[PDB]
Amino acid sequence: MIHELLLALSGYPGSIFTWNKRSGLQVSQDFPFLHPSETSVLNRLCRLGTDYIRFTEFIEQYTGGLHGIYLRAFCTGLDSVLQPYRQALLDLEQEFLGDPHLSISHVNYFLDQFQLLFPSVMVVVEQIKSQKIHGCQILETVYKHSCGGLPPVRSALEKILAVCHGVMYKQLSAWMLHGLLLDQHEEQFSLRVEILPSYIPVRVAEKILFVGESVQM
Amino acid sequence: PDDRSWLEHHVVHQYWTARPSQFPHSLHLHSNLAAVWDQHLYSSDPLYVPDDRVLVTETQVIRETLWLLSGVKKLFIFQLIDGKVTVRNNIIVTHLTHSCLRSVLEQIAAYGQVVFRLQEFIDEVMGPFRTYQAFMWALYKYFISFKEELAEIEKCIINTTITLAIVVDKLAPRLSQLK
Amino acid sequence: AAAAAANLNAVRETMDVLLEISRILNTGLDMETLSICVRLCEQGINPEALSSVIKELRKATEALK
């Protein structure tokens, strides 16, 4: 009970809260050993764990469709944001070891901090999945949503975006020093709008092209 | 009597040797979940349909699964079908309503198959190519260091409680490279 | 016994609870002094009396300073 739900919110569904691709973690089971209003509290609670499971599914499908070095970078930070949600579950279980007189509302109250982060990061993932954004414009749609308006989603995507720049900081180091272009294919030769983010000005790319091409001569 | 009595008392011997559990239970729903599930079944009027499992606590399963992940074979948990490990469902812990437990052990078995096939290949060179031979030694070199960590962790059980969520999240940076 | 020692666990629990209650009121009491006055109130005593004597003896480090 006080670990059953705490595995339901993690990657396991249980038969209590049945999984569905339409919408998972649905209570349909009726318990005479619960107050009838507990279903609504669990219904509030299941929305967060559904998002966590969906985030796991996206990593499962990819670590010809969605592919690229940015796509092997965007999923990686999505691990990193989920880690306090793991630690914050371990603390819950440690609480429930000593005092089992806490209720579902305590768990919801404790994981209310993830009801500002997770819903607003969920939509970004669905936008990137439904559209076929797998070039370097994924950094744009992260940066389009990282400005935010809620501080928790402001700090999350900031981390996620940063590693992407660190990937492109490795492509632009081989190019300007060793003279290697086509270190990563798309999604003479030059940078175009697909492999260029929309907040680097156009002049800088021409300067970079001059710098990289002059090395070979 | 005098050694069997010591066995019964001071050794476990209650699922891996068939002698149903006398583990002390202090009931009340967080761990009386099987009984409340049976009463709920009765209120839904099944009628009777009785399931038979051997009733273990959780931690023994954890040590067995860590043994499975280390690379040894032939354990009591996880029935083996044709060479592939598969979760057995004749084993119950009181809570987790017997359906979560199936899923968690099936995931650990899904990793155990990957470990088993590689160790099977390594065993099949022990009973001129010389490149296969250089390949299995490097695989083995990963495996011995990999076994070291889990063997360390299992010692700390004897000396503190450890749950499933600990052991799955602990092995993330290894199951990453296993894929 | 065994159930007689889980009670000793349980009074240790409450006295760490009372220890936090002592620390966030910014009292001069620690756990050990608290452990004496609970025994005194188990024998029965006015807390008005004990507060007065503690407010006196804390001024006795000031009478020798």
Partner: peptide, 23 residues
């Protein structure tokens, strides 16, 4: 005497067939 009994070590292995406050 309470502080004398107090210095003992307590088990931190909690049961899963007794989750609700075992000894």
């Amino acid at each position: 005497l309470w502080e004398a009994a107090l210095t003992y070590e307590a088990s931190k292995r909690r049961c899963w067939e007794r989750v609700g406050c075992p000894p």
